[PDB]
Amino acid sequence: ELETARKQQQSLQPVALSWEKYQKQERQLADWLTLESLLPLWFAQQASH
Amino acid sequence: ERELSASHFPVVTLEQLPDIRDLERQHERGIQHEIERVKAELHRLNIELT
Amino acid sequence: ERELSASHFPVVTLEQLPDIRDLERQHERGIQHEIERVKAELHRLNIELT
């Protein structure tokens, strides 16, 4: 029983690691997407000026 | 948003103003390039996660 | 290549020539939209295959 719980948790932990670093890359992508939309607005401001 | 866009993006001189839209295309290409690069890394990372 | 691009891509006369560049860019935007749609499908299918 102890070994079973051990193995279950041990396998799950790398899943948590991958999930969290994936979340980090997801936030990075969301931010990059934000910059993409702001690029037309920014260069439109500058072009108007 | 203006702070971020100014920190990331440049501004052009008066007579090189026609070039600003070349910079628009170049910056759009760069933003999309980084978006897809991070997206593909997220792709492979999701592969590993699954 | 020319026949292939033409068969998919519209061509317009002179009266909108300045706007034809923006039409080309909008067409490119739609092409990239289909690119990302197909790529999302490929993502899903790669997940399933793995």
Q: Which two tokens stand for residue C41?
A: 């499908």
Residues of C in contact with B50 (CB under 8 A): 47, 50
Q: Which two tokens stand for residue B22?
A: 């070349």
Residues of B in contact with A32 (CB under 8 A): 31, 34-35, 38
Find all residues with CB under 8 Å of B50, minimum gap 6, and list them: C47, C50
A36 within 8 A of B35, measured Cβ to Cβ? yes
Using H for helix, E for strand and C for coil, what is the string for chain B? CHHHHHHHCCCCCCCCHHHHHHHHHHHHHHHHHHHHHHHHHHHHHHHHHC
Q: Give φ, ψ of B6 to 5 degrees.
A: -70, -40
A48 within 8 A of B25, measured Cβ to Cβ? no
User: What resolution in angstrom units was achieved for this structure?
Assistant: 4.1
| Dist CA C39 CA B40 (whole Å) | 10
Q: Scanning the structure block, which residue is given the tokens 């103003």?
A: B17
Q: What angle do CA C37, C40, C45 make, to 5 degrees?
A: 130
Q: What angle do CA C2, C23, C12 make, to 5 degrees?
A: 60
> How many Cβ atoms are within 10 Å of C20's Cβ, its own excluded?
15
A36 within 8 A of B32, measured Cβ to Cβ? yes
Helix (H/G/I), strand (E/B), else coil: C6: helix
Helix (H/G/I), strand (E/B), else coil: C47: helix
| Dist CA B7 CA A40 (whole Å) | 15
B46–C47 CB contact, under 8 Å: yes
Q: Any idea what DSSP says for residue B19?
A: G
Write out residues 17-36 of B within 8 Å (CB-CB) of A: 17, 20-21, 23-24, 27-28, 31-32, 34-35
Q: How far B27 CA lies from chain A's nearest CA (Å)?
A: 8
C-alpha neighbours within 13 Å on the C-beta side of residue A33 = 9
